[PDB]
Amino acid sequence: WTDLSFQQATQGNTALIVFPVAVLLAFLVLAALYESWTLPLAVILIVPMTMLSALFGVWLTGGDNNVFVQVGLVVLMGLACKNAILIVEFARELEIQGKGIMEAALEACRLRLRPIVMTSIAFIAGTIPLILGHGAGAEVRGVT
Amino acid sequence: MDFSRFFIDRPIFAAVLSILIFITGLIAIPLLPVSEYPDVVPPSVQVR
Amino acid sequence: RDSIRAVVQTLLEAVVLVVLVVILFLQTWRASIIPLIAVPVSVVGTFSILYLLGFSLNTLSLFGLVLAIGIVVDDAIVVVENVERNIEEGLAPLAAAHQAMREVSGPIIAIALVLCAVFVPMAFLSGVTGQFYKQFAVTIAISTVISAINSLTLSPALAALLLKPHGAKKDLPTRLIDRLFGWIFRPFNRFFLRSSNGYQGLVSKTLGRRGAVFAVYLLLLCAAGVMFKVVPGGFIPTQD
Numbered sequence: 001w002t003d004l005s006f007q008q009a010t011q012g013n014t015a016l017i018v019f020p021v022a023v024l025l026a027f028l029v030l031a032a033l034y035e036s037w038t039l040p041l042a043v044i045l046i047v048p049m050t051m052l053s054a055l056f057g058v059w060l061t062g063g064d065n066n067v068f069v070q071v072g073l074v075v076l077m078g079l080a081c082k083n084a085i086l087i088v089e090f091a092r093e094l095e096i097q098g099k100g101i102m103e104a105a106l107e108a109c110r111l112r113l114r115p116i117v118m119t120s121i122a123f124i125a126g127t128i129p130l131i132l133g134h135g136a137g138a139e140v141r142g143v144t
Numbered sequence: 145m146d147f148s149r150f151f152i153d154r155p156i157f158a159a160v161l162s163i164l165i166f167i168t169g170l171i172a173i174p175l176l177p178v179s180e181y182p183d184v185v186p187p188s189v190q191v192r
Numbered sequence: 193r194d195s196i197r198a199v200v201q202t203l204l205e206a207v208v209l210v211v212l213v214v215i216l217f218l219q220t221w222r223a224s225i226i227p228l229i230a231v232p233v234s235v236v237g238t239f240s241i242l243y244l245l246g247f248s249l250n251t252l253s254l255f256g257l258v259l260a261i262g263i264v265v266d267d268a269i270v271v272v273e274n275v276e277r278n279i280e281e282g283l284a285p286l287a288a289a290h291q292a293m294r295e296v297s298g299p300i301i302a303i304a305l306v307l308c309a310v311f312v313p314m315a316f317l318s319g320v321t322g323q324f325y326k327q328f329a330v331t332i333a334i335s336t337v338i339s340a341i342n343s344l345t346l347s348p349a350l351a352a353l354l355l356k357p358h359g360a361k362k363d364l365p366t367r368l369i370d371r372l373f374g375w376i377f378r379p380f381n382r383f384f385l386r387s388s389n390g391y392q393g394l395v396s397k398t399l400g401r402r403g404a405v406f407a408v409y410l411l412l413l414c415a416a417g418v419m420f421k422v423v424p425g426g427f428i429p430t431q432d
Contacts (some may be wrong), residue, residue, distance in 0.1 A: 011427075026309050029309045052412060052416035055420070059423050064424045067324050067427035074329065077310050078332075118273065121264065122210055127210070129258070136194040140431060
C-alpha cells in the first residue's frame with residue numbers, strides 16, 4: 001500500500017482504544033466527585049444510547065464510519081454525560097435533604113428540565129449550519 | 145493539615161486516585177523501549 | 193482559501209442561531225447578555241493556547257470551534273437560569289447570585305472535568321487519525337475549560353449587577369424588546385409550560401414500570417453494538 005492507502009492500513013484500531021479508555025476515565029472521575037460506585041453507572045449507561053442514535057443518522061444517509069464520524073462520537077460522549085450529570089447530581093442532593101428515592105428523582109427532573117432542554121436545543125441549533133452546509137468543504141461538515 | 149483526614153471520609157475518592165495511577169502505568173509498560181543499559185554507549189562514525 | 197472562508201462563515205452562522213436561542217429562552221437583554229459574553233472569551237481566548245501548542249488554523253481546528261459554540265453557552269445559561277429562578281422566589285439579585293452559585297458550582301466543575309477526561313486520550317494518539325483527533329479534542333477541551341472558568345467567575349458577577357428583582361420597572365431596551373418580539377415569547381412560554389407539565393406526567397408513569405423500561409434498554413444495548421457492524425468502515429471521505 002502507498003499514499004493514503006498506506007496510512008489507512010498502518011493505523012490501528014484507533015477507535016478501540018480511545019473509546020473504552022475515555023469511558024473508563026469518565027466513570028472514575030464521576031465516582032471520585034460524587035462518592036459512589038453505582039451513581040456514575042447511571043450516567044455512563046446512556047453512552048451506548050448515544051452511539052445508536054448517532055450511527056442511525058449516518059446509516060440513514062448512507063454514510064460510512066470515517067474519521068469525521070468518529071470525532072462526532074467523541075464529542076457526543078462528553079455532551080451525553082453532561083445531560084445525565086444535571087439530573088443525577090440534583091437528585092443526589094435532594095436525597096441528602098431527606099427526600100425519598102422516587103420523590104428526589106421526580107423533583108430533580110422537574111427543576112432541571114429547563115436547563116437541559118435549553119442546552120440541548122442550543123447545541124442542536126449550532127449544528128444546523130453543518131446540516132445545511134454549502135460550498136467548499138460542505139461534504140466533511142455534513143458528515144460530522 | 146487536614147489532607148489525610150479528608151480522604152478517610154471518602155474511601156471511593158481515595159480508591160479512584162490509586163486506580164488512576166495504576167491503570168496509567170499499565171498503559172505505559174508496553175510503550176517503553178527495552179535495552180540492557182541506558183544510553184551510555186558513545187556514538188561512533190566509521191570512515192572506510 | 194474558499195474552504196477556510198466557508199468554515200469561518202459557518203462559525204458566524206452558528207453564533208447567530210445560538211444567540212437567537214438564548215434570547216428566545218431568556219427573553220431579556222439583561223439576562224441574555226451574560227451567556228453572550230462567554231462566547232468571544234472562550235472562542236477567541238482559545239487561540240492563545242493554540243499558539244503555545246504549535247497548532248494551526250486548519251479546517252479541523254476551526255471546525256472544532258464551530259461545534260464548541262453550543263457548548264460554551266451551556267455553563268453560562270445554567271448560571272443565569274438558576275439566578276432568575278431564585279429572583280422569582282423573592283430573593284434579592286445579590287442574594288440570588290450567592291444562592292445559585294452554591295448549587296451549580298458542583299455540576300459546572302464536574303461537567304468540565306468529565307469533558308476533559310473524554311478528550312485527553314485523543315491528545316496521546318499519533319498518525320493521521322491521531323492528528324485529526326488532536327485538532328478537535330484540544331480545541332473543544334480548551335474552549336470548555338475557558339467557558340467553565342468564565343461561568344464560575346464573570347457570570348455571577350454580571351448576574352448580581354445586571355439582573356433586577358421581579359416586578360421592577362422595564363427600561364427602554366426591555367420594553368422595546370417586549371413590543372417587537374413579545375408575540376413570540378408569550379406563545380412560546382405557554383407552549384413550554386404545556387410540554388413540561390405533560391412531560392412530568394410521563395415521568396410519573398414510567399417510574400412505576402422500570403422492569404419494562406430496563407427490558408427495552410437491553411434490546412437497545414444490542415442494537416447499538418449491531419450498528420457498529422452494519423455501517424461500513426472508512427478513513428477519509430472524498431470531496432469536491
